[PDB]
Design a protein around this nucleic acid. Structure first.
Ligand SMILES: [Zn+2]
Lengths: 54, 45, 56, 138, 49, 103
RNA sequence: UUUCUAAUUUUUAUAUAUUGAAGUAAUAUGUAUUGAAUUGAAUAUUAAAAAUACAAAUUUAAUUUGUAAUUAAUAAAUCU
């Protein structure tokens, strides 16, 4: 799922393309074209730590 | 804190050295001058 | 030494018939109700298909 | 992250608390008038047994020799001793009830000296008449 | 039963009554009011009853 | 604050429907035929003839229920507010194009 | 850095959410014109025509259907 480098680049290409809080990262999830139009904001991995990803 | 705001008027307190120290008769108006001229002139114990 | 300083006012301070156009595309807050717009709930506009079709 | 520690009267402060408005009101008092009665009331302030001279003349020292007005013991202040604030130690206490006057050679200096007063917290002074106070000899 | 827990403030101010932390139990007065408003006005989004 | 922010929703429709109650009980009530149960039964007869008398109301009979209507009021305030925003384009592109003119 | 002492500079500083607004309706210059095998608001270019408000799309070989109908959602109130 192409990390849209800033959050602001996120665009809803399809009718079924909506936003979702996938663990503190605003992402776009679509039932249709499931990974084709999927976008995920750039942010730390869902389970990071203070010594590994600052 | 280390940026103290006070009247620096405070840091040379004249409580012990008023002109009745150097001019010992000034309330007596005769205005005599009996100062301690230098640390050098100290005659001794 | 020269010192540059403003003249005294004889007329209105902010220019009115001399104002330069705002400079940002004047798509007003009401043509695209993007934000900063407050409307009474009785007077909600433009729901011609949602909730103005049955107005009150 | 100022204005959190200091107030809004910080960074948004035009520390020019000297003359954004007073200078205007100085040219206001310039406009109206001063005349006999406007000195005659001051005459009563000379008639007041308490003798603190009301009007003051900010004029060059050669000028006053030519038309001496010092008769009622009025104060002769160099216009900078007013501007610089060196005159506040002799200036009325009632900033809101006192109105002295300011004589001057040409009425531009007078208002230019009375604005200095209104910068020093003074409220009423109509600020000029080089010729009236001589026509009001007192 | 007559026993009541005498407590001037609830021992757990973030307790929930739903499923999630944002379903909290104790709500700020300045939001309890904007809640009692919507439950007492027209409900043009969520059906009622 | 509760009974206030809901009064945005009802007092105006109440301030209205409490003025009609005034207009009703003042002008039409005196000349209102109280034998309605007979009157209705007359139209249930006029309908069993089919050629009955359903009459349409007139403006003067109808203007009793004339009220401040935010269905229109609130709407055409926006449109008029908007055709000023639509007005500030041709007057903007005329102003910008008027900045290229020398002094 | 004579020695005992006194002291005002401290491996402690504030991190962006409330709300998959998705019900509420047949139509009517009109499937404009041009270019087009075809195109009807959603091929291509062309875009300041109108009137009785809804031409920068999805959809279909075309249309109709069908999604959609410019809205409450105040982090500001410093936290010491
Ligand atoms: Zn999509």
């Amino acid at each position: 799922h192409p990390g849209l480098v800033p959050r602001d680049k996120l665009k809803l290409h399809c009718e079924f393309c909506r936003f979702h809080w996938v663990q503190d990262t605003l992402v776009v999830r679509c039932a249709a074209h499931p990974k084709e139009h999927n976008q995920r904001e750039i942010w730390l991995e869902p389970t990071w730590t203070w010594g590994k990803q600052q | 804190r280390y940026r103290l705001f006070h009247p620096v008027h405070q840091t040379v307190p004249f409580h012990f050295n008023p002109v009745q120290s150097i001019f010992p008769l000034i309330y007596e108006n005769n205005l005599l001058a009996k100062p301690r001229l230098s640390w050098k002139d100290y005659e001794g114990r | 030494e020269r010192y540059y300083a403003l003249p005294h006012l004889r007329g209105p301070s902010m220019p009115v018939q001399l104002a330069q156009p705002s400079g940002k595309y004047p798509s007003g807050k009401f043509t695209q109700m993007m934000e900063d717009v407050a409307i009474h709930p009785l007077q909600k506009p433009d729901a011609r298909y949602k909730h103005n079709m049955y107005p009150a | 992250n100022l204005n959190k520690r200091y107030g809004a009267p910080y960074v948004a402060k035009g520390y020019a608390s000297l003359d954004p408005r007073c200078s205007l009101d100085a040219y206001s008092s310039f406009q109206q008038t001063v005349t006999s009665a406007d000195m005659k009331k001051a005459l009563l302030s000379i008639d007041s047994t308490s003798s603190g001279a009301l009007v003051i003349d900010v004029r060059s020292e050669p000028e006053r020799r030519l038309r001496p007005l010092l008769s009622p013991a009025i104060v002769a202040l160099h216009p900078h001793d007013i501007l610089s604030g060196a005159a506040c130690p002799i200036l009325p206490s009632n900033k809101e009830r006192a109105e002295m006057f300011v004589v001057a050679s040409e009425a531009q200096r007078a208002v230019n000296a009375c604005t200095a007063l209104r910068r020093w917290g003074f409220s009423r002074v109509t600020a000029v008449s080089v010729d009236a106070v001589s026509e009001a000899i007192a | 039963v007559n026993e009541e827990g005498a407590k001037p403030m609830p021992r757990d101010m973030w307790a929930i009554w739903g499923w999630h932390r944002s379903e909290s139990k104790f709500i700020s007065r300045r939001d309890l009011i904007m809640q009692q408003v919507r439950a007492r006005v027209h409900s043009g989004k969520e059906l009622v009853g | 604050t509760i009974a206030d922010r809901v009064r945005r929703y009802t007092d105006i429709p109440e301030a209205s429907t409490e003025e009609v109650n005034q207009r009703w009980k003042e002008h039409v009530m005196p000349r209102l035929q109280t034998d309605l149960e007979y009157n209705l039964s007359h139209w249930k007869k006029q309908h069993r003839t089919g050629a009955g008398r359903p009459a349409p109301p007139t403006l003067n009979e109808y203007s009793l229920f004339s009220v401040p209507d935010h269905s229109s009021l609130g709407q055409d305030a926006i449109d008029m507010l908007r055709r000023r925003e639509a007005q500030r384009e041709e007057d903007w592109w005329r102003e910008r194009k008027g900045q290229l003119k020398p002094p």
